[PDB]
Every structure is written in C-alpha cells, then in structure tokens.
Amino acid sequence: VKGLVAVITGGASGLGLATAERLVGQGASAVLLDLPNSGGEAQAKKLGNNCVFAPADVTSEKDVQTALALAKGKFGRVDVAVNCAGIAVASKTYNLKKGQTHTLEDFQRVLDVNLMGTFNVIRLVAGEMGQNEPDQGGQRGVIINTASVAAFEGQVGQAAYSASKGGIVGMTLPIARDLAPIGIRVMTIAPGLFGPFPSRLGDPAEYAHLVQAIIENPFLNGEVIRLDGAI
Amino acid sequence: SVKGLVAVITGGASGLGLATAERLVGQGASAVLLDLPNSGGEAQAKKLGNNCVFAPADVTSEKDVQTALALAKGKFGRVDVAVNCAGIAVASKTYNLKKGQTHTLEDFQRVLDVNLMGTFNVIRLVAGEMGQNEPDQGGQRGVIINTASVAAFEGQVGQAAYSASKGGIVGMTLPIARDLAPIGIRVMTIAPGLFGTPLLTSLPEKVCNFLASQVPFPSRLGDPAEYAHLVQAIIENPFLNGEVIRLDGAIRMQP
Amino acid sequence: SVKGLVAVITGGASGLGLATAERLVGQGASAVLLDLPNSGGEAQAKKLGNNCVFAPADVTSEKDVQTALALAKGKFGRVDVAVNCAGIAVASKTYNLQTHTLEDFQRVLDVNLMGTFNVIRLVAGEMGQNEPDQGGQRGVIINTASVAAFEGQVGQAAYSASKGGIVGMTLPIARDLAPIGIRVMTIAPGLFGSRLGDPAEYAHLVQAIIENPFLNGEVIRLDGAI
Amino acid sequence: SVKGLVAVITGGASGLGLATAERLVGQGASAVLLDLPNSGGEAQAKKLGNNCVFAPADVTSEKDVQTALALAKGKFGRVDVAVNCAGIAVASKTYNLKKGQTHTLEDFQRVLDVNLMGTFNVIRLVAGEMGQNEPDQGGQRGVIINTASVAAFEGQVGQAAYSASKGGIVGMTLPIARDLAPIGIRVMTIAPGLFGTPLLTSLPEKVCNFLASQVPFPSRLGDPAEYAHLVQAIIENPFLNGEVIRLDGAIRMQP
Amino acid sequence: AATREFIEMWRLLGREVPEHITEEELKTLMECVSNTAKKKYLKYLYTKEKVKKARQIKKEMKAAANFLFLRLWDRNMDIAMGWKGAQAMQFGQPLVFDMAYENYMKRKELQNTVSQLLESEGWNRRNVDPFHIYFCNLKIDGALHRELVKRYQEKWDKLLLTSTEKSHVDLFPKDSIIYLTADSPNVMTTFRHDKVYVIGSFVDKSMQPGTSLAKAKRLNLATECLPLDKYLQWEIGNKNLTLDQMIRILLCLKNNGNWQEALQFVPKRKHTGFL
Amino acid sequence: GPNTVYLQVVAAGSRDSGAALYVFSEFNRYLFNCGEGVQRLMQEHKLKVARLDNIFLTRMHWSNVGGLSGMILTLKETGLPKCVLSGPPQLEKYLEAIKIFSGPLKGIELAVRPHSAPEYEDETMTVYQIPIHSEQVRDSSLVVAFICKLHLKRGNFLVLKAKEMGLPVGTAAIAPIIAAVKDGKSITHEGREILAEELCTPPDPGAAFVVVECPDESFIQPICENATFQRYQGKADAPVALVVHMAPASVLVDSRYQQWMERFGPDTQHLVLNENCASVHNLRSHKIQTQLNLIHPDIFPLLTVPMVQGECLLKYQLRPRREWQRDAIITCNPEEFIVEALQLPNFQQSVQEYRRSAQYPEIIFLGTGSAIPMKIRNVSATLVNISPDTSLLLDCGEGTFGQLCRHYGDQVDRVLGTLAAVFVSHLHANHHTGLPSILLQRERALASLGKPLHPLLVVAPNQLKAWLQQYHNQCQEVLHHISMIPAKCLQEGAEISSPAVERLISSLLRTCDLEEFQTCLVRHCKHAFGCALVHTSGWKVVYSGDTMPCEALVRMGKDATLLIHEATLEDGLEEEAVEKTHSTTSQAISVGMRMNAEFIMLNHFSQRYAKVPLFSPNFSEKVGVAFDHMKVCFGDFPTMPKLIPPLKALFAGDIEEMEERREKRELRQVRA
RNA sequence: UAGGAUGGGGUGUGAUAGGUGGCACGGAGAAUGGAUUCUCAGGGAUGGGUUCGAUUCUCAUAGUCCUAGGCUCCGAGCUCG
Ligand SMILES: Nc1ncnc2c1ncn2[C@@H]1O[C@H](CSCC[C@H](N)C(=O)O)[C@@H](O)[C@H]1O
Ligand SMILES: [Zn+2]
Ligand SMILES: [Zn+2]
C-alpha cells in the first residue's frame, strides 16, 4: 500500500479514522472526507504531511466534488475509497401500548446520511478513479462499504437503520457489476458492535486490518463479509 | 378463510395490486384501492362492485394516506389485510467511463422515495389502524404483505437505485415483523421474479421472450393471479411471519 | 385443487407427515404412508380409509423404497407429490472440554440427507413417467430442512449439517429436474410439537405449495420469525 | 503474525493446500501435509524443506487421521491452525429422463463421506489436540479453516452431491463456532469457487476459459496464492468467526 | 498486373466485372484453369459489389428521415447462451460433425460448408437443450480450420465445442455410433437418446453420393437414414438436407417433438405436405 | 445456327462391330451407319437417341443395315413422332419387309429421303447425296457418299474498339446495331457511317466434311470421275475440312486412290475406320469375362499421304478450334479388373475354397438376354459343337457373329466352316434377325479356309421365307447361299411333303452326324417350335424356346441329358409371365424334375434383370444358370453347384441393386 | 434400362431466347426506449462452352419426381403357298 492514495469518508473518527491511521502508518496516503465542523483536522495534523482533511457534506454533490478536486491537487490520483460515515436511531415503527409512530423526518435523515450518501460518494469517486492508469492486474481502484449485520438481523427499533444497511447490502452487487468493465472492485464489510467469541467489543484496528486485506487481495469482489465474532 | 375480510391495497389500480384485489373481492373479501389520483383505478373500483372503493392518495405523503385510511375506516369499520404493491423502477448506470455519464442523484432519491420510504410510510400508518382491532382467535389482528423483487438479492447492471430500495425493504422486513409481533400483526414479503406486470409487458416481444426463457421452471413470465394466490395463502396461514418468499421459478439474474 | 392427486409421504405414520396425509386425504387426495414397519402406521392408514395405504420401508435403503414405490404404482397407478418428513436428531456437542461420536453423526446424516436424496432420485424416476399437465408440470417434490440449517444451536452440528446439506442441494436438484417439469421446494420447520408451530399449519402450507404453480427452487422458513 | 505457528493442512500435496503450505512455510510457519499415501506428498515435503512434513492419512478413517495428528504432535508439539482443503467432486445429474439414468447411491455416499463426513471427522479430532493448548492472548486457542465451494449457494446442474456436501459444511459452520466458542477455537469457511485447483481441470479447457471470462473482475481463474493470502488474513484477524466468505471475484452461478 | 489489365479490358468490353480488385482475391482469381470459372468468379465479385453499393445507398436514404432494465443488448443474450452451452458441453448429448472431406471439396463447396456450419452452430446455441458438438478429423492446418478461424476471428478460441484431430471411433464405443446418411437402408423410427449421431460436414450439392455410406461401411459403425418419405409427401427436391436443417430437426426430436412437428424445417418447396 | 458441331466414332470398323460415325450438333443429331451391334455399342457408351432426327445409311447391305430393326423399335419406345431415313431408294421396300415379323409402323412415322430426292438442309447442316455406281428394284453396284456443308457463321463483334467511334455499350439499344452489322448491313449515319469490317469480324463460310465408303477396288474410278466431288475438291471455296474413308486397306494403298485424297489440300484431315483397327468396344463384356475367368479358366475362357486410324469414341470438333480430341478414348486394362474382383468382401476366400474342392459335345452360350439388347447380355444364341468338324447354331439373334468373333478371335473362320445347320424356333425380333450376318461371314470364312461353297441348311418356320424372299428380291442377294427346310417337316407326326425336302433333312442328319432330329410346337405364338437331338453316343439335348410349362413338351423330352429352358421372370410375378406367355423360375424348375433331366439350363432373362436372376433355395444340384460366353461340357455338371457362392459374391452389388429397385417399385405402390 | 419434369445448400418468391429489378424474412463477428454504425456470408444444381452481354442457349455428371404393351400378308374362312 506504499504510495497509494485513499479517500476515507467519515475519517474524522471511528472506523474511518482507524483505517486512515493504520494505512498511513503502513506507508499509504489518506484524504479525510468528513463534515467541516468535525474534529478531524487535529487528526490530519497528527498523521503528518501525507494526510489531508477535506471538508465535504456527503449528501451534497458539490462538497464531495470540491473535496475530490482537493485530492487531485494534493496527490493527483485516488486508489481506495472507504465509506464509514453514518448515524444510528432506535425507535419502534409503531407501539400500540403507547400509541407512538416512528417519525418520518428521522427515517429520511438516516436514509440520507447512510444509504444515499454512500452512493453519492461511490458515483463521484468512481469518476475520479476512472482517470487512473490500470494496475498490472487491470485494477483501477477499490471501493469498500460498511453495512452492519443489522441489514440481516436487526433488533427492535432499528427498522430505519436496518433499511439503510440492507440498502447498502443490496447496492453492493449491482455497483460491482457496473464498475467491473472499468476495473473498480466493490466490497462490503458488515461490522458488529464496534467501538460467543471474541466476547469483547470489536477493536476498530481489526476493521482497518480487514480493509487492508481487501485492498491487497485481488480476487475479493461483490461480497459481504460479516466481521461480527459470530454473535 | 378470507370471507368478510377488509383489505387495503396500495398500488391497486394495476398489476399485482389489481390482481390481488380482483381475487380477494372475487373470494368474498372487501378491498380499498390505494393509488395516485390521476390513475385509472376509478374504473377498476366500479368493475369490482360496491365491496370495493377507490381512494386517491400518494403513498409518499402522510396526509394522503391518512385521509384514505380515514375513508376506509368510515366505509367498512376495520382493516384486516394490507398489500403493498406501489413502486417505480429506474435503470441507470452509476458511472460510464466510455462516455462520462454519471448516475443523477434525483433519480436515486425519487426511487427511494416511492419504493422504500413510501412502503414504510404505508406500513406504519396501516399498523396504526390495525392496532385498534379486536384480536382474532389466536392473537392475530392483521397481516401486512410487501412486494420486494429478486433485484434485492442479485441486482443487474443499472439497477443500483432499484436494488437499493428493494434491498432496504428486504433488510427492514424482519425488524418490523418483530416490532408488530407482540401486537399481533403479521408482516411478510414476496419477492417476485419476472412477472407480466405493465412494467414488463411494455417491452418488445423479443426481450419478453428472452426474459420468459430465463426462468428454469415454469419457463414463462409470472401470472399476477399466482401472486394473488400466494397473497391469499399468506393470509390464511397463521405461521408465515417475518420471511421473504421468492416467487421466481428458481431464476437467478445474470449480470 | 389437490383433489384426485396421489401423494407419497415418507415418515407418514406420525408428526408432520401424518398431518399432511390427513389434510390431503380430507381434501380428496390419495396418500401413501412410507415409514418403518414398527411405527404403527397401519393403524393410521386404517383410520384414513381406502384412499390411504401404508408401505413399510426404511428410507436409507434403495430396495425398500423401490418396493414401496412399486406398491404405490400398483395401488394408484401414479405419483404426483412427494413429501420428505422422515428424520432423526441428536444433540451432542462437537467437542466438550469428550469428542462427538462418529456413529451418531453417520446415522443422523444418512437418515436425514441420504434418505432424502434416495427418495428424491427414486420418486423422480416414478414422477418422470407422468404426462405433463396444461402447465407442463409433472410433479412436486417437497423437503424438510429445519431452521438449524441457518441458525443451528449448540450441539446441533450433525443435525444442522444435514439440514444445511438439504438446503444447499435444493436448488441444484431443482435445476436438474427443471427440463423434466418437476418442481422442487423446501420448507424449514421451526419449533413444532408465541406458541410452538401446529403441524396442521405446516400441512396447510404444503397444500399451498402444491397448488401454486410458480414456487420452485426456494426455501421457505415456517418459523414464526424466531 | 503467523511467525512460529504450526499448521496442519489437509490436501496439502497439491492445489490450495500446497499453496497454503508454501505461504506459511515461507512466512516461517511449520506445516504438516496430510494427504493420501498415493499422492506425491513426500516429494513436496522434501522440496519445501525442514519446516514441512508429509503425514499419510485417509480423512474418512479415524485411525489414519489420529496417527497423522500424533505425528504432528510428536514433531512440533502443538497445532495452532488447521486448514481443510481435501475434497473430491462428481459430475452426475440426479435423474435424467432422456437417458433414463439415475444417480448411483454409492457415488453420492462416497462423495458425501470424503467431503462432508471427512471434514467433520478432521474438525472433531483436531479439536481434541487443540484443546490442550494454553490460550493465546485474547482467549483464542486455535483456528480451523474449511473449504466450501460456491456450489453450496448456487450449485450447477450435475453438481448435486458436491453441492449437498458443501451446503452441509456451510450449514454446520456456525454450529461449530457456537460449540467451540467456550474453549476458544475459531472456525471459518472460504468459498473459493473457480481456482487453480485440478477440479477445474477435468472439465474441458474451453469450459474453463469461458468460466474464467465470466468472472466480473478480475476475468480470470483464481490464483491459489490469493487463497493463501486470505487464509493468512483470517489467521491474523481475531474477529472473523463462524462466517462464510465468498472468494470468487463476484461471479454468480447460472445453470 | 497483367490480369489487372485484362480485367480493365473486359471492363472496357462492358462485361459483368467489379470496379476494383484486391491482391488476395486476384491471386484467388488465377486459381481457375477454365475461362468459364474465371467468368463465374468475377460475376460473383461483381454482384457482391453491386449489392454492397445498393445497400449503402438505401442506408443513406433512410438517414434522411420508469424502465426497469437498460436495453438488454445482444451481448447479454450471448452470455446466457454461453452458460447454456457450457452446461451442454458437460451433460449434453454428443453430436459429431465428421471432417476429413476437405479433399473432395471445391473452394465454393468448402466456403458454403463453413457458412452452413456457422449457421448450424448458431441454431444450436439458441436451443433450450443443445448438443455437445464435436469436430472430429479437423485438420489444424487444413483449409477448413483456416476458414473457420477467419470467419469466427477471435471467437474461435471461445466457442463452446470440442475440436479434435482424432476420429470419432477413438472417442466413443463403436456400438453406439450411428452415421446419418440419406442413402441408408435402415430407416430411423425414433430418436434414441443413448446413441451418438454423426453428421458429415460435407457439401457437394448431391453430386458424389455414397461418400458417407462408404465411410460407414468401411468401418463397423451403425448407419441410419431419416424417414422423410414415410411421414411426408415428396416432389422435386434432394434428400440430403442442409446442416442447419439437420440440426434443427434433431433438436426438435430431442425435445420430444413428433415427426409432424420435426419435419416443419424441411424446405416447403421440396414437398407438398404430410400424409 | 449452332455454335459447336463435332463428330464421334462409335465403331471403328472392326470385324465384330462394323463402322459408324455420329454427327453432333446443338439443333439436330445425325448417324451414318446402322449395322449389327451398333445399337448395343451406343447404349453402352451412353449415346442418347432422344433427338436422333435423321439416320443416314451409306450402303444397302446387311453389314450396314443389320441393327436397323433394333433402332426402329428403340425409337418407337423413345416416343419420337417422326424419324427420316436417307440413302438408297430401296429402303421403302426394305421397310415393307420389316413389318412381316413386326407390326406395321405402330405409332411412329417413317420417311425416306433417297439420293434422287432434292438436297435437304437444316438450321445446322446442308446435306447432298452423291450416287456412285461400281464398274460392271435391286441394284448391287450402288454406294452413296455424303458431303455435308455447314452454315455461315457471322463474325464476332469488336466492342473494345467500338467505343472509339462512340457506339453505346451495355444496353439493349445496341442489339439492333449488332444485328445489322452481323448481317453485312452498315449502321446508319450516327454522325458518320460505319460499315462492315470497321467494327466486325469477317464471316466464316463454313467447313465441310465428307464421308466416303469404298468397299472394293471397283469403286475407285467412279469416285475419281465424279464431277460433284470436283466442285468442292479443286477450289478455294471453304476447303472440305475432313474426309472419312471407310474402305478396306487394300483400297487405300492403290496409287490412284492415294492421289485423290491428297488433292483435297494439305490442311484436310483423313479418318479411316478400316478392318485394321485394334480397339476394345465392349469394356463391360471384357471386364466380366476377365473377372469370371479367375473362377474356372476352362468354363470362362478369355475373349480376344497423312492418315489417322480410327478408334472407339474418337472425336473431331468442327466449329471451334479445328483440332483432334483424345479425351474419351476407351482404355482396357486387365490388371484393374482383377484388382476389383480381389478387393470384394467375400470373393477372394471363396475362390480359394472352390479350387481346393477338386471333350465333346460342348455348349457355348453366345446370348441369353431377352427382347431388347442391354449392356451386358446380348440377344439369344447358342452354339453346339457336336464334333470337331460340325457345329449347330440354336438361335441367331442380332449381332450374334460379333459375340462369336470376340470369343474365338482369329479362329472364327475355321468354326464357321464347321457350321452345318442353324435352327430358328420362333419369329421374334430377338430370335432371328442375326441370320443374314452369319451367312455372309460364313461365305467369307469358307473362302479363306478353301472349303467348297456348299449351301447352309436352315430349319425354320415358313413365315421366315417371306421375310428373306422380299429382302433377297429387293435389297441384297442371299438365297443363293441357303437351302431352307420347313420346320413342320421335322415334327413327330409330320408327313413327307416332297422328295426334295427329305433329301435335305436326310442330308442334315448325315452332315451333322446326328442319329435323329425332332421338333415340337411349344405354346408361345403361332408356329413356335422346339427341338430335340439324339446322338449315336446316346446323349439327348432338348431346347424349349419361349414357352410356359407345357404337357406336349414333357412327353416328348423325357430323360433328356441337358435341357435349356426360358427363365424370363421370377416367382414374384407368375401372373405377368402367363399374360406375356413366358415361364418363371419355379415353373421351369418344376418342369425339370418332371422331365427328369440330368442337368437344367436357363436363359431368355428379362430386361428388368441386369446380371443374375434370383437363386431360390429350390435350386438343386441339377439346375444351373447361363451367362454370355460361358463354356459348358457334360463333365462340368458336378462342378456347377460349387460355383454358386463365388458368383453370388462377385455380383454382390448388382443383386443388391436389383432388390432396392424392386423395393422402390413397391414403395411407390404403397405410397399411392 | 429408357424417356420426359426439374434442381435458388438459410427460407419464400421475380425479368417469361439474351440488356431491365429484384423484393421481404433469417445468420456470423465487434461496439451503442428496441432503433443505429462498421465488418463477414451475397456464384438463381456441379463442371465445360457460346455470345457484345447466359438464370433463361448447349453438352456431360449426379440427386429427385412421373411413366414404361402386346403380329398380320391374300384368298381359301385348324392347314396351303
Ligand atoms: N435426408 C437425410 N437423411 C439422413 N442424413 C442426412 C440427410 N440429409 C443430410 N444428411 C446428413 O447431413 C450431411 C449433409 S447432406 C450431404 C450429403 C452427403 N455429403 C452426400 O454426398 O451424399 C450428410 O453427411 C448426412 O449425413
Ligand atoms: Zn418370343
Ligand atoms: Zn424368346
């Protein structure tokens, strides 16, 4: 991963930040794409001159486009994109014992940040990735998405969250088929309880390790991997 | 049996919704056709007799569906079944390097709005209406049936927005079924394959024959009456809950 | 509807198989109870009247199944539906810090999985001789593969392995038999005897699967969302 | 890292088992090739050098596998990783109305015994050896990796026995993960699909070329070194457990 | 260039000859001892130019004038037929095209044979249950192999059929082989799924009869002929049917069709109707 | 006018075939000889007779008009409405004589163009008949020679230089322009006039060819003194391209004749079909005899100034490039024939097996084929060699002498000297037409051998008297060579008509050394006779002829040593045989056990039959079969049954071919 | 064995002793609201030949369909010439 340039959506914290810290340590170059008011600027200072913070609202085409133009200015190319930004909401669809209905605005906001924002990033960075000169394996880039196991078995009150992550799960295969003739691999990670066995909470570093493994391995494509310790 | 049931059918003016209404009314049920005001459902409601009523309501909007449900409760006093068949399809590649076109965002948003958000908007309000019902012998108060697609599991090229919406419906089918299970409302999902709905009959005969031949068995496009049959079977069977049934003749979609 | 159809039900002397026979015979079909000689199935066959008959056979052997299918073809001249309800289970853990015994794994595997394939391959020989109806169908084959194939519990390794194999092999067999006109379907019965599933609801679902012409190559979880 | 780990690799005389032995021995892991005496296992072990050993054993027989594990314990004193790459296939249709032929029961039972029963036999006997290790930091005691080709999900025509055995392995993957969790052994499964394994050699080379071209990306057969890379990634990563990972470049099987 | 001047002349004479000629087709032109053969070859080129230009003209004339799927182009159908072919190559019933007839065939016949093989394979791919096509006795450096690779271009390496230099007797049990020929004394009563049928890829416009029968009788293979007359009235027409008609008949019988359905692919100009 | 015209030599003048040409043209077809065996030769070499408009006969002689009856029957069967004959005016009387033993002009129309008639021209040829009278109404010193002049061919149109003056090219508007210039008319004033050679090839006046027959030295001077020949010979007007000479070699070597050909110019060719040709005419006949000889050598013996010697199938094109053409020359190679027999699936082992298993009178079967001549079997004939000095001919079909000459080669002259009598049993077009050929060749053989010229003895029905009487009176002197005995006088119940008849029949018994001669009436037609001969040695031979199983024949021929019976048809069609008055195999076979013959022989096979009849299991050790050119001795009777397997193997294909044809006829019946 | 009828090698059909016109459908390869562009196959049985130009004009070979039969010459009137 030496010399490679990555754009990491949601890189100011969580799985995105852990991926940027590990990959840059391994000698890669990372672009942190996150909201302007996030504290990711301190992180981009911490990682040194190989890292750059690009302020962008993922739901807006213009903000992401200018962030990508910043990436083109700093490094000239994009090789990896990791989608991690998101929020969660717990609320039952309907509760007869209290007469309460899930509000539509909360559902729309979760869908906005999680599912459509991910596609917006994919569709724009694929335009950026298409400018790369093919790898000796024919590869132009790698796109990695995060769709927690809630897409498969959600808990009570996660309907909107499970809907968004199931959307990303359904979206993985058609995008991989879309970008296959361009040479971009699309992969999905299904994280669980990240901060039977292992019984502790997951460590974001194991997610970063899996991201590096997916980047390195040329044959992983169009698949969802549950990294959940079998719970 | 379905004798005496009152059904609310979204997208009931055509396709699977219309075939479901035709079957249930023919079998002795009552139906409410839920579709856009400018549609052709008014003729269908006249066709089905005084057991059926047309309710002009756009499923993306709360106020339309609430007005339609108030009409339904005024006319028949109860809601026993809900069938979700409304939806739209859009095909467009995410990005095409040869010519440089990119998937426009508004087509993605309006697909999510009609398919995924419209479905949840209907489910939560209908579940609100069924929650007032006296539970049937066995604790059941009602049944809600959704319409996913095989595109929710193996999307083809250019169905990113459509597959995203149907995959969201598949993903969210289980947590809602767990939410309303204590209340006694059953939630089920049918994943039809290639069906001779107006979405597919408008295609030329050559591609129609190609799509029909792709099904292993029976090698034909699905007949909407068979979808209505499975809907009735789900209504009668007390133990189908929180499951996705592929009604596709064992077909698998080639990329 | 199912009136006039002839169904062969393995494990028909009790449980889900018997409840399926009771439903189909009540609906006017004909049923053959294929089960072990000591199961007491002859009493059940006597109860359901002259439309039903019991054929003693051990499903893990080719000869007994062949003799039973010969008896059914003599009695009714036709086979239209096959339901595989026979099976056994064990609850021994793979390793217990004791090791799982091999004989129990072989026995449950061959009774569940091997018996099912032996029945499928012979009934398809019988089913292949029917004339296709107006829809082109020659027969329907229905299998049981408990939800342990998906969320097997502790100690159900052998049982979950057998049901997972049935789930995995449902689609390739459906693809094999598709040009013959035989539909193949799978049901995944959950906790059967917020209450346990009543076998009459399984029999109802089996009837629904028989009637609906377009269900093929699919696994249906009849589990009440557990 | 895998430095210092001892791995037992079934089917290690060729294909994926040999690729895995090559990678781990190259990374400094000691390996034991467990394969039938008819194969050239001792030649590969002599080629790989002092960190490789050939153990003649038949996986369907309890005493041979027990002898092989005793040999491994005597040579290296422990087992930290186990990889199940042994397997055989048959191409025969369940029933063939045109030809009037039926799948033999001996062929199905032989394939089932080698693929499915042999895998469980190895898991259950190795676990008795792994149960003696003092736990690694973090509660892990050992790792078990299985091989269940993509036929377990979308098996092709004439692949019923093989698909049934791999479907069983897929089905029982999670139950074993629940069984061994209290003693700290992880069980994982790889779905390699079209690889450099000789199983993709009995078919005519034109079928192999078509199948390689049909992979979305990269449009080629898998390289066993990529399987070994994924095996190392699974060994290193503590949180992958009881899950099936499809390694096929996103290809989906048509009949 | 001597002959280029010669063609300019005949063109100056106003004969049916083409506007231009390429080098390789000129070197083909000198491959004809009889002046009549040169005439017929040249008229073939002239008429090719004639229709090519006429169609370009009509092409220029017409120029003056919530979907679920993107247009399902020709490639997607081709890939689906590819998957069906790849299954047929493993479990399908063998069908043999028996080469080695390259010696007996004039250039015109060899070209037409290649065209018929192309069409026959095309009809085979689209069918619901294809045969496993074998090309046996197919010389690597022979005339046919070079024409097939020319006609298919880079498709040739990707066709889902078995091409071999061996003979069919080296691949199959000799009891199960049946050489189809119209001259056979045995009449085909029913299509048998356990047998292997051999079709001679041989086009001679009915002009050297008995070649297939001679090859069959030289060996100990079984032989059969189609029951054309028994189940179909006849009139003025050869009984050796084209390769694509042969394959579409066998594909019809293979799918459990009856004779009165299979013989629909016989050209209607050859027979009045069924008995 | 036609664009191509060429000649072809059907027969090259060999003693067993005579000589004949064949003029080919696109619009008409012509022939110039109709002798014995010409019909068989033309059928063998695939020479179509469909559009044979005219037949030219160069001389009234049985060696030149021998096969005329066979052709007449063939043309009637072809469906031709009219055929025109040309030659001596006596043909009309000849045509009258033909109807006695046939029908009178049934269906088809016959016309005669004598030499005195005005010349006849066609769209392709103008024909002049030149009468020539020898030195020193029947006329025995007339020979007609033909001079055929072709039509003028318009020259080619020069298009390459036609554009120089600007004439249109590639449109129908030039069609009237080309027609005018090709007819010698100048094209009109298209800005200026263009005439004849300025755009058109000069015309070709036509190349003529002459056919000349000079049977003897007496005709040399009349040919030289003829004025009409000098009209074409001595001039430059279209010098006759080729002159075909049909004359004995002794005539050509004459100095006066030799100078006559040379005066035609240096470019003129000369074709000669004389008696010196060495070429095989019947390839299939040679093949079969060579093939069968591998089985038994004794039973199947082997057969036997610029100028251009004629050959079979030799051609000469006339309109195109005037060149000689050696492309259809017959090629005889015994090695290939024996190779084909050995490569047969079952032929080779059987003949080895046959050989490891193991004189007068001797019977030679010259002819066994029925009504019409076919490719392999000629018409009926049978030679009997009673003693080394005497022989008896049992039936004389058309071209019998040709088959006899091929079988015996140079020994033919000696055999005819031993020829004592000829037997005619029923007046069919395939049982008697070959008699006149035998008499002339017998006279020639007697002259060469120096034997005295004693008349031959012929025993035949009285109706044959009228046919020969008219032919002798009108066409050619024959009767001074024969002393004819009515067949009725040799009956069992006959009575002495005249003392003169008794002297001849008594003479026949002494000459042929027979002990007694008898005849009987079989039931085939009016005045159809059998025969029976008993020798002093004690052996008896009975000849049936065309018949059906009869009772009078059975009583007379009891305990015969050898019986020859008709076997036209098989067991399948006994009703047709009765309708056509012929016997089937089982009917003949049943007759043999009842007649209690030592051996049984069959002949008169039908035209349906190609090589062999069906060998039913009823075929015992006494019943045999006959083929052309086979030798049968009394000692070969035990051998004959052993030959059945090899003959089946050698004729595997044809017997296979006959069965398919019978099947096809049944199929058409079934599909009706 | 003979005579005729005729042969569109992807399928239906025309311009019919010579100039004119072919039309509609189908197939192979490589790329994009069911259409488009390029490319491949375009010998009206096979092989010779003629004409300024041949599908139609002629021959040879092969396939295919239909069809293939028999005595009066004159008066005595079973025999006579
Ligand atoms: N009517 C028919 N009956 C049986 N086989 C036939 C047939 N028509 C064509 N075929 C088969 O398809 C091929 C092409 S037809 C060519 C016939 C062959 N070359 C010959 O000269 O006679 C042949 O090899 C033949 O085996
Ligand atoms: Zn006669
Ligand atoms: Zn006769």
PDB file of N, CA and C in Angstrom, chain A residues 59 61 116 119-120 123, chain B residues 88 90 102-114 161:
ATOM      1  N   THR A  59     -23.975  14.274   1.522  1.00  0.00           N
ATOM      2  CA  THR A  59     -25.232  14.316   0.787  1.00  0.00           C
ATOM      3  C   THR A  59     -25.221  15.343  -0.340  1.00  0.00           C
ATOM      4  N   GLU A  61     -23.510  16.952  -3.728  1.00  0.00           N
ATOM      5  CA  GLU A  61     -22.579  16.656  -4.814  1.00  0.00           C
ATOM      6  C   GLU A  61     -21.434  17.668  -4.880  1.00  0.00           C
ATOM      7  N   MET A 116     -28.004   6.919   0.697  1.00  0.00           N
ATOM      8  CA  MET A 116     -27.774   7.760  -0.479  1.00  0.00           C
ATOM      9  C   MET A 116     -26.429   8.478  -0.441  1.00  0.00           C
ATOM     10  N   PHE A 119     -23.883   6.100  -1.900  1.00  0.00           N
ATOM     11  CA  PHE A 119     -23.940   6.045  -3.355  1.00  0.00           C
ATOM     12  C   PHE A 119     -23.364   7.315  -3.970  1.00  0.00           C
ATOM     13  N   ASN A 120     -23.636   8.475  -3.365  1.00  0.00           N
ATOM     14  CA  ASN A 120     -23.105   9.733  -3.889  1.00  0.00           C
ATOM     15  C   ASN A 120     -21.579   9.727  -3.885  1.00  0.00           C
ATOM     16  N   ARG A 123     -20.434   7.168  -6.668  1.00  0.00           N
ATOM     17  CA  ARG A 123     -20.619   7.690  -8.018  1.00  0.00           C
ATOM     18  C   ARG A 123     -19.616   8.791  -8.334  1.00  0.00           C
TER      19      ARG A 123
ATOM     20  N   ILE B  88     -41.893   2.296  -8.273  1.00  0.00           N
ATOM     21  CA  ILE B  88     -41.404   2.713  -9.580  1.00  0.00           C
ATOM     22  C   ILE B  88     -40.016   2.122  -9.767  1.00  0.00           C
ATOM     23  N   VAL B  90     -36.263   2.572 -11.982  1.00  0.00           N
ATOM     24  CA  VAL B  90     -35.391   3.408 -12.803  1.00  0.00           C
ATOM     25  C   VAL B  90     -34.115   2.620 -13.056  1.00  0.00           C
ATOM     26  N   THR B 102     -22.867  10.051 -15.401  1.00  0.00           N
ATOM     27  CA  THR B 102     -22.900   9.663 -14.001  1.00  0.00           C
ATOM     28  C   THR B 102     -24.361   9.532 -13.600  1.00  0.00           C
ATOM     29  N   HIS B 103     -24.633   8.594 -12.697  1.00  0.00           N
ATOM     30  CA  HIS B 103     -25.975   8.442 -12.153  1.00  0.00           C
ATOM     31  C   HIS B 103     -26.429   9.727 -11.480  1.00  0.00           C
ATOM     32  N   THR B 104     -27.494  10.326 -12.012  1.00  0.00           N
ATOM     33  CA  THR B 104     -28.014  11.548 -11.420  1.00  0.00           C
ATOM     34  C   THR B 104     -28.664  11.242 -10.075  1.00  0.00           C
ATOM     35  N   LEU B 105     -28.536  12.189  -9.148  1.00  0.00           N
ATOM     36  CA  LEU B 105     -28.957  11.938  -7.774  1.00  0.00           C
ATOM     37  C   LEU B 105     -30.475  11.951  -7.621  1.00  0.00           C
ATOM     38  N   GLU B 106     -31.170  12.809  -8.375  1.00  0.00           N
ATOM     39  CA  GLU B 106     -32.623  12.907  -8.238  1.00  0.00           C
ATOM     40  C   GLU B 106     -33.360  11.633  -8.642  1.00  0.00           C
ATOM     41  N   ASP B 107     -32.836  10.876  -9.609  1.00  0.00           N
ATOM     42  CA  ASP B 107     -33.466   9.602  -9.947  1.00  0.00           C
ATOM     43  C   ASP B 107     -33.322   8.595  -8.817  1.00  0.00           C
ATOM     44  N   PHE B 108     -32.187   8.640  -8.124  1.00  0.00           N
ATOM     45  CA  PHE B 108     -31.975   7.778  -6.973  1.00  0.00           C
ATOM     46  C   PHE B 108     -32.890   8.196  -5.835  1.00  0.00           C
ATOM     47  N   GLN B 109     -33.014   9.505  -5.612  1.00  0.00           N
ATOM     48  CA  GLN B 109     -33.816   9.963  -4.491  1.00  0.00           C
ATOM     49  C   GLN B 109     -35.272   9.599  -4.725  1.00  0.00           C
ATOM     50  N   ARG B 110     -35.778   9.822  -5.945  1.00  0.00           N
ATOM     51  CA  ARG B 110     -37.192   9.574  -6.185  1.00  0.00           C
ATOM     52  C   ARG B 110     -37.505   8.083  -6.212  1.00  0.00           C
ATOM     53  N   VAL B 111     -36.513   7.235  -6.525  1.00  0.00           N
ATOM     54  CA  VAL B 111     -36.743   5.799  -6.403  1.00  0.00           C
ATOM     55  C   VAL B 111     -36.835   5.408  -4.940  1.00  0.00           C
ATOM     56  N   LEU B 112     -35.944   5.947  -4.105  1.00  0.00           N
ATOM     57  CA  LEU B 112     -36.033   5.630  -2.686  1.00  0.00           C
ATOM     58  C   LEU B 112     -37.346   6.138  -2.112  1.00  0.00           C
ATOM     59  N   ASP B 113     -37.756   7.336  -2.535  1.00  0.00           N
ATOM     60  CA  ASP B 113     -38.960   7.972  -2.016  1.00  0.00           C
ATOM     61  C   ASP B 113     -40.193   7.138  -2.327  1.00  0.00           C
ATOM     62  N   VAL B 114     -40.304   6.649  -3.562  1.00  0.00           N
ATOM     63  CA  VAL B 114     -41.506   5.908  -3.921  1.00  0.00           C
ATOM     64  C   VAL B 114     -41.444   4.486  -3.374  1.00  0.00           C
ATOM     65  N   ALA B 161     -30.288   2.010  -7.981  1.00  0.00           N
ATOM     66  CA  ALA B 161     -31.303   2.625  -7.126  1.00  0.00           C
ATOM     67  C   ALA B 161     -32.441   1.653  -6.820  1.00  0.00           C
TER      68      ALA B 161
END
